[PDB]
């Protein structure tokens, strides 16, 4: 009786098709363009031994954490390029990092299948492992804090999970994907999150209940990055077919596509600006592009790296944007 | 210019850098390897005997240190991953070599091994990474051929029209049929390797048994040759 599934699929497709009458390009056709955007490098941060995989800004817009394949976490001071801490890990194949909103903890994980939480404010002067969370059956690809006691992870196996840090257990388990889950992004009010997998689909979940809420489709290939619009009602994705897309939660549709005929490499990171007018994306051809979110025209280029750009992040007050590459350097742009 | 606390902070940063330099010294002198193979391949025996003769339930990756002639090696393998591989193989595009272990006494699961090797060889992120292949469990192949119950021509049609290459070196003295068989296996793998190399990476074959005691030296020799090739490319000699 899978015909019921097929028919329900066709019915959902039709209901989606009805609601589309105008596209975002038509409505935005009557607004002024952003023009050229020149952004120059200000600082260069040196000290990593090998390629960089992740970075994440602090809430105060000054501190910064980065992770590298040599087995280090380094906490930087962006304004002066000093080094504040250097945490040596026990497994060298790290693939993610996060920096808690309060500023007390950091997290990291990788091919070891463990999410490790570190304590930065102790009576002794060192940084000590607070807790190790185990229970996944594959590599951990992303992790994000909700508050000081809850964390959300995504794994190489199809599952995402929500942990309690005091008593280290899974309160809720999210199932439903088919391929590897690769990215994660929390809503600004911390009641929903979206995840993107290797079956070319993304899903919105509900934290309190634990059921899958909606499912979006497109993209013809893997999804490597995902991010919420500041509003809380849209998100943008990046894929291995050299395209980015923007989805909206209420319309359950797709709005615009950012693509060009010269670009043939895949996207590795996506981030929005403070107002939502600029979409920043990294690429495998060593360069980072700046797109205009409402008109789908390139506005600028950030070309300063000698290998692929792996991470990208915009600060909370909108002053700066940072990028890290496989040449083991971070660059603060403005 | 800048106050007292900022001077103390700069001092702290300079000390942190010193330690990183020390770490770099320890990291530029260690060679990293990756161990790949199937379930029937005896890679567990290799790693166990190498760990003995020298010097946690869903855990994902293992470690193994060993030393030959005062040179350090790390050897990693992946424990609790799924069947798909195209995603986490990108973390290993700077290793020195990939060690590939294939069982040569199955005759039934061998075409899958050939396909897997073909997938590793042509990966987009593994161009400029060499491969050391071990054709393990030789003696089992010896009894299997000698008994004669199980043929080989039935699974592979083109075996009849094949004859031993002129540069073969059967050392201890054994029946020629086993020599023909094992060189046919090696020639399949080397044909896949020679298809599209383009001169950027090479494949080093070996015949081994999982119990013998000469594998570390083989890896040492092959890594010597690989690093020599890279240094020729770097120092503008070719």
């Amino acid at each position, epitope marked *: 009786l899978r015909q019921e599934a097929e028919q329900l699929k066709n019915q959902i497709r039709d209901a989606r098709k009805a609601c589309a009458d105008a596209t975002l390009s038509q409505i935005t056709n009557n607004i002024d363009p952003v023009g050229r955007i020149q952004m120059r490098t200000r600082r260069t941060l040196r000290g990593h031994l090998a390629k960089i995989y992740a970075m994440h800004w602090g809430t105060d817009s000054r501190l910064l954490v980065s992770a590298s394949q040599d087995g280090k976490l380094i906490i930087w001071d962006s304004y002066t390029t000093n080094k504040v801490h250097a945490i040596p890990l026990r497994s060298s194949w790290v693939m993610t990092c996060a920096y808690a909103p309060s500023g007390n903890y950091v997290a990291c994980g990788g091919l070891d299948n463990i999410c490790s939480i570190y304590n930065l404010k102790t009576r002794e002067g060192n940084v000590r492992v607070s807790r190790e969370l185990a229970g996944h059956t594959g590599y951990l690809s992303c992790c994000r804090f909700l508050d000081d006691n809850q964390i959300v992870t995504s794994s190489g196996d199809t599952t995402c999970a929500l942990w309690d840090i005091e008593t280290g257990q899974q309160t809720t388990t999210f199932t439903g994907h088919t391929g590897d889950v690769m990215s994660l992004s929390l809503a600004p009010d911390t009641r929903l999150f979206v995840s993107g997998a290797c079956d070319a689909s993304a899903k919105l979940w509900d934290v309190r209940e634990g059921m899958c809420r909606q499912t979006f489709t497109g993209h013809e290939s893997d999804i490597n990055a995902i991010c919420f619009f500041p509003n809380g009602n849209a998100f943008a994705t990046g894929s291995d077919d050299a395209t980015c897309r923007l989805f909206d939660l209420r319309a359950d549709q797709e709005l615009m596509t950012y693509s060009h005929d010269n670009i043939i490499c895949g996207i590795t990171s996506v981030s929005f600006s403070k107002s939502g007018r600029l979409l920043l994306a990294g690429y495998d051809d060593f360069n980072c592009n700046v797109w205009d979110a409402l008109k789908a025209d390139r506005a600028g280029v950030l070309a300063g790296h000698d290998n692929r750009v792996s991470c990208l992040g915009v600060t909370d007050d909108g002053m700066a944007v940072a990028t890290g590459s496989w040449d083991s350097f971070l660059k603060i742009w403005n | 210019t800048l106050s007292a606390e900022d001077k103390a902070a700069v*001092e702290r940063s300079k*000390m942190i850098e010193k330690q990183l330099q020390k770490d770099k010294q320890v990291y530029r002198a260690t060679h990293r390897l990756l161990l790949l193979g199937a379930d029937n391949s005896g890679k567990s025996t290799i790693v166990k005997q190498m760990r003995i003769y020298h010097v946690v339930k869903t855990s994902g990756i293992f470690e193994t240190k060993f030393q030959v002639d005062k040179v350090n090696f790390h050897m990693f393998d992946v424990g609790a991953q799924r069947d798909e591989r195209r995603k986490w193989i990108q973390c290993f595009n700077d290793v020195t070599a990939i060690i590939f272990v294939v069982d040569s006494s199955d005759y039934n699961r061998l075409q899958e091994a050939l396909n897997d090797f073909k997938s590793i060889w042509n990966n987009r992120w593994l161009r400029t990474i060499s491969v050391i292949l071990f054709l393990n469990k030789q003696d089992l192949l010896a009894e299997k051929v000698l008994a004669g119950k199980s043929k080989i021509e039935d699974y592979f049609p083109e075996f009849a029209r094949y004859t031993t290459p002129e540069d073969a070196t059967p050392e201890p003295g054994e029946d020629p049929r086993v020599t023909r068989a094992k060189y046919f296996i090696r020639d399949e793998f080397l044909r896949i390797s020679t298809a599209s190399g383009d001169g950027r990476h090479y494949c080093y074959p070996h015949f081994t048994c999982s119990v013998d005691t000469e594998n570390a030296r083989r890896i040492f020799n092959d890594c010597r040759d690989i690093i020599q090739r890279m240094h020729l490319r770097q120092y503008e000699l070719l």
Partner: single-chain antibody
Amino acid sequence: VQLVESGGGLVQPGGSRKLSCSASGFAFSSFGMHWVRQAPEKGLEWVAYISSGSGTIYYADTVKGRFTISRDDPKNTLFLQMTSLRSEDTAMYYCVRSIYYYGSSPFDFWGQGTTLTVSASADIVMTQATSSVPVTPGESVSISCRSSKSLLHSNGNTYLYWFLQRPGQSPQLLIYRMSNLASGVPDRFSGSGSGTAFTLTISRLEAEDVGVYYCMQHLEYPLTFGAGTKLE
């Protein structure tokens, strides 16, 4: 964490002695160390400072050549070598711990002290007001302070510190860098200021808040303290 230190007793004028401070319970090698002294009934005065890595040392004006400071990381001990001891050196010496990075809190732990009795310019000055305020429990008090040169820096930081010394024991940190409550202090305390004049305020006093309040500056060496005010 605890620092326990010993040395000292009656000693003749003109001699020399060596003081030691034993540390345990924390990572000694990544902290700076200070020595702070006070006379039998007067206030505090700074003595020396040795940093992590032993690459930076400072001394006061009155001990510029007689004293010498050193540390021993693997044995986890701090030393102060005194030579040619006059009679103005009778005081009680303290062992204080300090770390410096963005957002840290210097001067946060103080050790107990060793008594030492000897038988018979262009630097910032900090002035305390009238040194006595009678108070009844449950009221509110407004201890004040003053300075000569402005302590505000182009960073945006203001370097002023506050300490409390109960009758029995060694001082405790309350406010660091003019507006931050140190870890472990109740939320009753609060402090503010305006660039040259400063103020510390206590909301609803309790029976364990009586003592002497000292101020401190950290803009440039040497570090000057001020007389302090008592509460009864």
